[PDB]
Each structure stands twice: as structure tokens, then as C-alpha cells.
Design a protein around this motif. Structure first.
Motif, PDB file in Angstrom:
ATOM      1  N   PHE B  34      -8.999   7.217  -2.334  1.00  0.00           N
ATOM      2  CA  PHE B  34      -7.935   6.967  -1.374  1.00  0.00           C
ATOM      3  C   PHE B  34      -6.846   6.086  -1.979  1.00  0.00           C
ATOM      4  O   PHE B  34      -7.058   5.371  -2.960  1.00  0.00           O
ATOM      5  CB  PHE B  34      -8.484   6.304  -0.110  1.00  0.00           C
ATOM      6  CG  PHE B  34      -9.301   7.219   0.753  1.00  0.00           C
ATOM      7  CD1 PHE B  34      -8.841   8.480   1.081  1.00  0.00           C
ATOM      8  CD2 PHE B  34     -10.525   6.811   1.250  1.00  0.00           C
ATOM      9  CE1 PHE B  34      -9.590   9.320   1.878  1.00  0.00           C
ATOM     10  CE2 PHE B  34     -11.278   7.646   2.048  1.00  0.00           C
ATOM     11  CZ  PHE B  34     -10.809   8.901   2.363  1.00  0.00           C
ATOM     12  N   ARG B  35      -5.666   6.144  -1.366  1.00  0.00           N
ATOM     13  CA  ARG B  35      -4.501   5.387  -1.807  1.00  0.00           C
ATOM     14  C   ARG B  35      -4.348   4.150  -0.930  1.00  0.00           C
ATOM     15  O   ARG B  35      -4.131   4.266   0.281  1.00  0.00           O
ATOM     16  CB  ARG B  35      -3.245   6.256  -1.740  1.00  0.00           C
ATOM     17  CG  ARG B  35      -1.937   5.488  -1.806  1.00  0.00           C
ATOM     18  CD  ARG B  35      -1.461   5.350  -3.239  1.00  0.00           C
ATOM     19  NE  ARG B  35      -0.008   5.275  -3.337  1.00  0.00           N
ATOM     20  CZ  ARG B  35       0.675   4.152  -3.504  1.00  0.00           C
ATOM     21  NH1 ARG B  35       0.067   2.980  -3.585  1.00  0.00           N
ATOM     22  NH2 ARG B  35       1.999   4.205  -3.595  1.00  0.00           N
ATOM     23  N   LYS B  36      -4.460   2.973  -1.540  1.00  0.00           N
ATOM     24  CA  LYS B  36      -4.337   1.728  -0.796  1.00  0.00           C
ATOM     25  C   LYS B  36      -2.906   1.518  -0.319  1.00  0.00           C
ATOM     26  O   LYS B  36      -1.946   1.879  -1.004  1.00  0.00           O
ATOM     27  CB  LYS B  36      -4.774   0.545  -1.659  1.00  0.00           C
ATOM     28  CG  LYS B  36      -6.079   0.758  -2.398  1.00  0.00           C
ATOM     29  CD  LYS B  36      -6.544  -0.524  -3.064  1.00  0.00           C
ATOM     30  CE  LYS B  36      -7.285  -0.239  -4.358  1.00  0.00           C
ATOM     31  NZ  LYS B  36      -8.226   0.906  -4.224  1.00  0.00           N
ATOM     32  N   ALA B  37      -2.766   0.929   0.865  1.00  0.00           N
ATOM     33  CA  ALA B  37      -1.445   0.649   1.411  1.00  0.00           C
ATOM     34  C   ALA B  37      -0.773  -0.468   0.623  1.00  0.00           C
ATOM     35  O   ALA B  37      -1.372  -1.518   0.376  1.00  0.00           O
ATOM     36  CB  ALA B  37      -1.549   0.266   2.885  1.00  0.00           C
ATOM     37  N   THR B  38       0.478  -0.237   0.233  1.00  0.00           N
ATOM     38  CA  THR B  38       1.267  -1.190  -0.542  1.00  0.00           C
ATOM     39  C   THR B  38       2.485  -1.579   0.283  1.00  0.00           C
ATOM     40  O   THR B  38       3.380  -0.755   0.501  1.00  0.00           O
ATOM     41  CB  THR B  38       1.683  -0.593  -1.885  1.00  0.00           C
ATOM     42  OG1 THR B  38       2.501   0.561  -1.665  1.00  0.00           O
ATOM     43  CG2 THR B  38       0.461  -0.197  -2.690  1.00  0.00           C
TER      44      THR B  38
END
Lengths: 273, 54, 218, 55, 110
Positions: B34-38
Motif C-alpha cells: 500500500f501507498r502511505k499518505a503523504t
């Protein structure tokens, strides 16, 4: 890769008015792994290419191809011997490999027995192998025998193998070259004659003790190969030339060999008591 | 019963393990992570220079 | 596999940039004196817990009431330094966020609302926007080669950051770039090579627009 | 059937002039087997059918 | 024993749901399509907790209609097929379904 093997069926008589049930057929498989990448390379400077007369690219490419072919042949011959040395077929319904012995000395298993073989023993072993191949229900086409030059010219002088031009067709069909009662006899320098050790990069079993080998009688289905990448030639001329003035050539190929049917291979060997 | 199948997967018609000669296949989908929120990319000052060390 | 590696590399670069920005915001919060002697500097707010020695047990014992009181103290400190009343933010981690949400006072529509028990969110406390992030500075950090700014400190007792949009700035020189080599590298090394690179720097501008909340003992 | 999985990458700093080598990526997979065949069946007669007034 | 399963109230269920939401947030899961499957007994034990349906804070429920729709961002559904009894292996299954599910209460998944 996997090669499935299917057995054989049976028959009987039917009594009217009764249900048919059915019989079972045996199954098995043969698995061949893939070895590492085989490469041949060379480097040519710029001054030598400037000062030269002829073209060296094509000659080098031919030599690389020849070297790769030689290695492939040696591996295939070792695989044929290993196929001949297998006692039990993976499918129980079919027979296994055979070895034919020639008693030739009073010493232990040594080279004197190999050097003491005459033509009469070679002819006897040839006819024994032919009979064994006939017993195994092998097809009449594409039967071959591979033997090295010393034993080849020991055997050709024998008076029994002459005037026996009949049998299957096979390859080498251009007129008459070589044939004895259906078996085609050829010469080769790549037979396994020395005991062999394991080498890194090989994922199959090629190593064994081949010092007693004399000849191989086989068919076209004893050994199979699986190709992943075919032969390929490469050459660098863009940034290598700038970094260090010259040209680089590579030639690579990927495959693997294994045993398919041990009942299609027979081996002749010389030993003592 | 009244029938005797070949089973197509047993070796030499001996023992159990009727799925020994079957292979496994590629389903068609790769999982990955998954892509972490930045969120810190904004909420601060961004400038740009064309040359210089600072 | 060449379609997933590019995504992974881009994500890694973005994560590194975010972590560096958060570390710089914390460092700005920890700066005691402004570079200009007249202007005020950064300030930290301490949540006293017990008489225990310095441990993570103080971090693990924080309740939602302490968080609400600390947020109100942070708002007071922001208003003391004559900051504008817009674009104030607070960055907190999910554990503390959900310890805060379950405190029913902050979501009571009867007083000020701005929340939802069903949606499981809080949106604003004391005029400060509240957001969640997994990239806060929560460990101790050591200096690494290639860093021309000071990112290293001991962030063991961090809880959250209350900052502004003018606290920290960044400078960019070269943008992102993706490259791949296959012409002659293929023959020398039988393979392929992929790169991704970018150049920038970050630093502290105004120490007075950043606040640190930390939990410790006497 | 097999479902492959791909892990995360990393980052570092570059010194001018030198050569980059590369980092590693973790890999794994998940497998799902195939069950046997489920069945549901019934048999309807004709006389017992005639002993009926609905379908 | 099942005496522990029979003693659960709605406050425990709400606390567990909030903990599950927090753990889902830590694992970097998306913010949409989170579900919670629960059996009727625990469903109607959770509905009787007036805080979760109180429209003063978040609402999303009805005491008269006897339903609750969303708690801590997780959708709530009812099912009669939750695993509650210890399972034995049956012939024809090539996977592993058997376990001891005697302590199960609910499931939060994606």
C-alpha cells in the motif's frame, strides 16, 4: 519441464447383457531442469583493427558458435550414458536400461581390458545389442551406434560386419555411407571416457565414472533437451568505444538436458572378473 | 461404484496422492504493498533557484 | 517486474522527503533562540505524568483529557506570539488520535461540535486543524553522509506537532528523473539497471511558528 | 494458483564520480488450492408424481 | 467457557471496534469499504448501547427502528454464517478450514 508418459491397455471378451466397468492405465513423468547461462566473449582493440587486413568479426563469431556446440555435444553424450545406466523405468509398464559386458583380462577394472579389445568381441557385442533392441519393441528406423576411431577401425576390418546393408532408413541417407543390419555406425570424439566431477552452474546430474565405456547404442528418444533462449550474438559499439577504445562480443545460450526413456539406450563396457 | 477410474494423477497406480502429476498456474494478479499518505509536501514553503549552493 | 519497481522507487523517494520535512519542523520547534535577537523563539509544552524516571511508560499513559488541555495551551501560545488565526495545523499519530476522539466532549454538538462518532473523526479543536500521519519523528536520529542540514536529535518523547505554513521552507535545484540503461550495459553485465534521483534541501525559517508537545516526568 | 507479492525499496546518497550498484527487493507468494466437486441431486418418479395436485 | 462469551456487553464491543479502527489505520489501509460481520445476539446487544446511536455526537442509528449503521467508520452487517463451533476436517477439502472457533465474536475485514 515435464514429459508425461502413458502406459498401455488390455482387451477381453464380452458376455451379452452385462455392464462394462473399465480398466486403469499407468502414468508417470520425466522432469528436466535448466542450467545456467553459457557465455563466450572476446575483446579487440582499436589499433589492431586499424592496422589489420581482413575481417576478424566473422571468424570470431564462427569460433564462438563452434565452442558452444562442442560443450552442448559433450553434455548430451554424458546424458545418453546416464540414461543407459538406469535400471528402472519411471513407468513400471516399460523396461529399463541395459549394459553389455566384455570380459577381456585378469586384472582389476583397468585400462588393459579397454586396450585389449579385438574386433570379434566388438561384433559380438554389436549383435547382442541389436537383439536386445529388437526385444524392447523399438522401431526399426533411426538406430545408431557411436564408437571412437580406434575401436571403429578395429571393427571395420572384421569379416562379419560386411555385406549387411538392410534395415531402416534413418539419417545419413545420401547413398551408402555406414550400415550394419539396420544399425548405423558413426564416429565421435566426445564419448565419455574419463571419470567426471561436479561443476558449478549445472543443475542436472552429469558426473559419474566413465572409464570403462566403449560405445553407445541408442535411439532418437533416449535423451531430450529444453531450450529457454536460443543462440544469440551481441556486440557493443556505442559507449564502450568511448570509455575504452575497442569492441566487445558475447555469445550466449540457455538450455538443459535430461533422461527421457531408459529403455531406448544400451551401453557396451569392458571389465574383468 | 460400478466404475474404475484411471485418476490421471497417480503414479504407477500405487498408493495415495492422486494430485502428483498436476501443476500450479499463475493466477493473473500481483499483490504489492500500500501507498502511505503523504501530507507534509504542502503545509510548508517551496522555492526554486536556478544556480548557487544555497 | 519493471512496472512495480518504478512505483516502489517513487514511493520511497516521497517517503524520505516527508520524513525529512517532519524532522525539520520538529527541529524548528526545538530552537530556543531566534536568529534575529528581537523576535521570539520556539516553545515546547510538557505533559507531566508521574514521579517515574524518563521512560516510554509516560508516553503510553497519556489520555484524551491531557491531549485536549495541551491543544488549548498550544492555541494560547500561538495567540501570544501574534500569529494569524488561519492555517494552523496539528499533526498526531493514530494512537493519540483515537485516544482523543473517544473523549466525547470534543465531538459534542451541544458545545462546539465538529466531529462524528459514526464516522470516527474529529476535525477541529480550539481552532486548530487536526490531521493524522505515520511519518512523525519518534526515534533518535544520527548524522548521515550527504546531509548539509542538521536533521539529527533525540525524538523519543514526541507526541505531536503544532505548526504553521511559514515555519519551514525547502529549496529545489533538480527535479525527479527516471532513467534506464540497456544499450551496452546489457552485454557486459547480462541485465538491466534502473535509477531515480532528485536534489533539494530544507531548513528552518521561523522558530516562533512551531510548537512541540512531549510527555515526560519531573 | 499462485499470487506473487512485492516488497518495498530504499534510498541513499550519491557521491560524485563513483558507480551505483543496487539494492535488493523482498519477494514471496501465496497459494490457493482447488477443492473437490460439490453436488446436489434428487429423483422424481411418475406414479408418485400422479399422486400430486401441484407442481 | 462460554460464560465469558455470554457476559459481553455493548461497551466492550464499541471499544473493540475503535481499537480495530485504530489498528487498521496503523496498517495503512484505505479509508473506504471497511466492514464488520456480527451475529444477531451481539448486534442487538450493541444496539441497546445508547451512546453509539446518540445523535448528539454522531448518530447513525435508531432505537425505534432497531438498527445501527456505522461505528468508527466501519460498516456493520448481520450474518448467520459466522464460525462459532470447532470444526473437524472433512474429506474432499484441499484447504485448511478446521479450527476451534468457540471464542469467536465478530470479524473486521476488507
Amino acid at each position: 519441464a515435464q514429459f508425461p508418459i502413458v502406459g498401455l491397455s488390455s482387451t477381453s471378451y464380452h458376455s451379452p447383457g452385462t455392464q462394462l466397468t473399465g480398466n486403469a492405465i499407468k502414468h508417470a513423468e520425466a522432469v528436466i531442469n535448466i542450467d545456467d547461462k553459457l557465455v563466450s566473449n572476446v575483446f579487440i582493440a582499436d589499433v589492431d583493427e586499424a592496422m589489420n587486413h581482413y575481417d576478424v568479426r566473422s571468424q570470431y563469431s564462427v569460433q564462438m558458435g563452434n565452442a558452444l556446440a562442442y560443450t552442448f555435444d559433450q553434455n548430451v553424450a554424458a546424458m545418453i550414458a546416464q540414461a543407459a545406466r538406469t535400471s528402472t523405468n519411471p513407468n513400471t509398464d516399460l523396461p529399463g536400461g541395459t549394459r553389455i559386458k566384455i570380459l577381456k583380462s585378469g586384472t582389476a577394472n583397468t585400462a588393459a581390458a579397454v586396450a585389449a579389445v579385438t574386433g570379434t568381441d566388438l561384433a559380438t557385442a554389436l549383435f547382442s545389442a541389436a537383439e536386445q533392441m529388437d526385444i524392447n519393441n523399438l522401431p526399426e528406423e533411426d538406430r545408431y551406434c557411436a564408437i571412437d576411431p580406434t575401436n571403429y577401425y578395429k571393427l571395420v576390418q572384421n569379416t562379419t560386419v560386411i555385406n549387411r546393408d538392410f534395415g531402416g532408413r534413418g539419417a545419413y541417407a545420401e547413398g551408402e555411407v555406414l550400415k550394419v543390419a539396420g544399425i548405423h555406425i558413426v564416429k565421435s570424439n566426445h564419448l565419455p571416457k574419463t571419470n567426471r566431477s561436479a561443476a558449478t552452474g549445472e543443475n542436472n546430474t552429469y558426473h559419474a565414472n566413465y572409464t570403462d565405456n566403449i560405445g553407445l547404442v541408442f535411439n532418437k528418444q533416449a535423451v531430450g533437451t529444453v531450450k529457454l533462449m536460443d543462440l544469440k550474438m551481441e556486440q557493443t559499439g556505442a559507449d564502450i568505444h568511448a570509455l575504452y577504445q575497442g569492441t566487445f562480443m558475447v555469445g550466449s545460450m540457455m538450455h538443459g538436458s535430461g533422461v527421457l526413456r531408459p529403455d531406448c539406450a544400451i551401453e557396451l563396457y569392458a571389465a574383468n572378473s | 461404484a460400478n466404475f474404475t477410474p484411471s485418476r490421471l494423477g497417480l503414479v504407477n497406480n500405487t498408493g495415495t496422492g492422486v494430485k502428483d502429476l498436476f501443476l500450479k498456474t499463475f493466477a493473473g494478479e500481483v499483490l504489492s504493498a500500500f501507498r502511505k499518505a503523504t501530507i507534509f509536501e504542502d503545509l510548508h514553503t517551496v522555492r526554486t533557484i536556478s544556480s548557487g549552493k544555497s
